[PDB]
Design a protein around this ligand. Sequence first.
Ligand SMILES: *C(=O)CCCCCCCCCCC
Ligand SMILES: *C(=O)CCCCCCCCCCC
Ligand SMILES: [N+]
Lengths: 405, 405
Amino acid sequence: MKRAVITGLGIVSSIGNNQQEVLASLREGRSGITFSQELKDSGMRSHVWGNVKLDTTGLIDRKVVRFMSDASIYAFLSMEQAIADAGLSPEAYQNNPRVGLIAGSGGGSPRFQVFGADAMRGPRGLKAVGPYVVTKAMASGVSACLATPFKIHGVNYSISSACATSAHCIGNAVEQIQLGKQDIVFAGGGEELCWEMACEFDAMGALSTKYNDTPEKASRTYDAHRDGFVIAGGGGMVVVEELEHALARGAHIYAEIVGYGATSDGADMVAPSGEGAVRCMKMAMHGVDTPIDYLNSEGTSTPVGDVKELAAIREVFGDKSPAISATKAMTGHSLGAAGVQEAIYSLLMLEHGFIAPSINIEELDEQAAGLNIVTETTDRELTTVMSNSFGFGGTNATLVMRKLK
Amino acid sequence: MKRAVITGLGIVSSIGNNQQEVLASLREGRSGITFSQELKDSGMRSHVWGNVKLDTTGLIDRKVVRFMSDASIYAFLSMEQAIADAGLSPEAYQNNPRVGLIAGSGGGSPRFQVFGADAMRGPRGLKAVGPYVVTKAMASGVSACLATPFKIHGVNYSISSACATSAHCIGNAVEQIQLGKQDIVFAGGGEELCWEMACEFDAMGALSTKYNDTPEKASRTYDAHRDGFVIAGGGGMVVVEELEHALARGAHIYAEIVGYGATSDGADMVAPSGEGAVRCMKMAMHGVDTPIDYLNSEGTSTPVGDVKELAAIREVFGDKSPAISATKAMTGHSLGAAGVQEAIYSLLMLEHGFIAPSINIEELDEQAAGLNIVTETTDRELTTVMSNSFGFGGTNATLVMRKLK
Ligand SMILES: *C(=O)CCCCCCCCCCC
Ligand SMILES: *C(=O)CCCCCCCCCCC
Ligand SMILES: [N+]
C-alpha cells in the first residue's frame, strides 16, 4: 500500500520554541523545567513544571484566537512552523479535500471548564461566561481550532488517549494515507499547563515532589531516586504526506513512518502492564528488517512505569538492546503533546545524526543494568528510530521512523 | 478490502435504557425532555434537558466505577448490552489482540474537572480531590474506562470531534476492519449531563430557552419557531465486526457499513458551512448502488444549523429526496454520544422496518420546501439508511448502513 513520510515539523516545547532551539537543547542536555509559584500557591506538593517560555499574545489573529485555549494556541503555532518547514503554500493545502488534520489534547482545557463554572456561579452568571468557552473546553478544541482557520477540507477530528494522544494522531494520519483517503494530514497535539489540571495528578501521587529546590533535577528517568513525573505543556505538529506526492513536489523528507503500533493492556487503569507495550513495539516492528538504532522511551520518571517499560524493551529486543534515552528527563511530560514532541525529537536526532542524553541519572536503577542507556550526547549515524507513548487506561502507541535513501 | 458489519448494539438514552425501551419511544414518538431544576438553580435560561432516567447505583462493581465519570458509566452499560446482544462471551473478546475499542466523549467530564478544582481550593486540598479524578476528567475517559475492565487488547483510544464524536469512532472502527488490523471493534461513546457543561452552551445562546414551561416541545427541529437545541446525556455502543468473522460464528447482522464520510468545512468555528456536509454525504454515498431510503439528519433544532443542512441535503439529492427525520426532536442533543445513538436509532428503524417521526413541527421551515420530512411513524421496508453528524470546528461525519444481501 501507500507509504507515508514526514515532510515538515513544528514545535513549541519547554526546551524550545522552534526546531532550532530544540536541537540546541537536546545536544546540550538542557533542562526545560523551572520552579512554579503557581503550583505552589495552589497548594500542591509538586512545585516544578516544563513551561513554554513564550508570550503568545498577538501571535494569532484576534478573531481566531478568541475561540482557543492554550492547547490550541501551542498546536496552532506548531502547525504554522510545520507548514513553512514543509514548503506548503496556501493554495497547496487550503480548501483541498485530500488534505486533513488529526490532532488532539489529553484533557481539553481544565482551566476554561473551571472558568465557566466559576463565572456561572458569580454575580454576573452567563454574562461572565461569554460565548467562547465551548470551543476552548471541548476535547476536540485542538483540531477544531486549527482545521477552521487553516481552511482544512479533508479529515478533521482529534484522537484522545491520555499520554499516547498525539502518538495515535500521527499513526491515524498514516492510516489515512495508507487507505488512500488523503495526500497530506497534519498530525500532532497540544496541552495547556495549569494547576487546575496538575493538582489532579498530584492528588494521585503521580508528580515529583522531593526536588522542588532543584527543579532541573526533578525529572530523572531511570534514576534509583526518581519520584514521579514533572508536568509540562506545549505543542507539536508534523506533516504526514504520501510518498509519491512528496517526491513530486520536491519536498524535504525527514523519514518514512515504517511502523505504527497501537494496543491495549486491558489490565490496570493507571499502571502499565508491560505486556501491552511488548505487543505494541512488536506490531510497529512488523516488516521492519532494519535494526532499531535509537529508542526514545516513554520514560515518565515514575517508579513503576520506568521499570515496566525497560522490561518490555528487554522482552522485545533481548540481546539486541538498542541505544536508549528518555527526553522527558529534560523536557518534562507534556501529556497529550508528548507523542508528537518526542517523535519530533527523534526525527531531529535522525536528521542530525546524534543521540540526546538521558540526564539526571546519578544512580542507575538496578533493573536497568545491561541496557544501553545513553547519558551523554553521542554523535552517530542513525537510520531507524523508535518512540514509545503509553497512557492511563492501558493505551499504547509506538512509532518507527526510518531514513530514506 | 474487508467488509464491516454491526453485530450488536447497546444504548442508554433519554428515551430508553435499552434498545427495547428506545424502540418503544421511537414508535410512539415520545419525548425524553423534562424540566431540570438543576439547570434552573444554576442560573441558566434553558431549563430543560434529555436526562437518563436510570438509577445506575450498583450496576457497576465498586472497584471499577470508582475511576469513572457519567460519560464512562453510560458507555459502559451500553457496552455490556452490546456484548450480550452480539452473543459474545469473555473467551471470544477478552485478552484478544484482534478485538479493540474506539469510543469517546465530547468534553470528558466538566463535573469532575470542576469538582477537582473546587475540592483543591478547599482546606483539605489534595486530600479532598482524591486519587480518581484524572481518569474521570481526561478526554479519553470513555475508552480508558471500558477497555481496561473489559480486558481489551487491541486498539484502544477515543476520537473526539464535538457533536460528530461517536460517529467518527464508528467510522474509524470500520477502517480498522478494512485495514485487516482488527476482527472486532466496539465503537460508540457517552456524555454526562450537568449544569457545569450546559451553562457554557447557554452563555453561547445555543440552547432553547422559550419553552421551559412545555419541556417536551422545546426541541422542535425544522419548526419555524425553533430557538436552539436541548442538551442531553447518555451513551451508545455498537459491535463493528469483519464480515467473514461474523458469518463464521453465525452472528446476527443488523447491517453492513457500506459508507463512511469524514470531511472538514474550514470555515466557521460554530456554524455549519453546508459545503462540507455536501462533500461528506457524497463521500459516504460513493459506491453505494442502492438509493438512500431514510436519512437521520443532524437536525440540531437551531435556526442556522437546520437551514444549512436542509440546503446541503437538497444539493445532494434534490428532487430524489429520501425520507427525512430528526430524532433529536424527541431525544435532545447528547453531543458526543449523539453519533452512535443516532446510528442505533437508524439501525432499529432499518431492523424493524419503520421511520421515526419528526415531532414538534407546528410550522415547517421555508428551507424544507421540496423535502420529504416524515412527521408521523411510518411503516416502510427500508434497505439503506444514512445518518449525519456535524460538530463545532466544521467537523463532518456521515454513515451509510445497509441490510446484508
Ligand atoms: C498519561 O497517561 C497520564 C494521564 C494524562 C491524561 C491527559 C490529561 C487529563 C487531565 C484532566 C484533568 C484531571
Ligand atoms: C456540537 O458540535 C456542539 C459542541 C459540543 C462540544 C462537546 C461537548 C463538550 C463541550 C465542552 C464542555 C466543557
Ligand atoms: N517516546
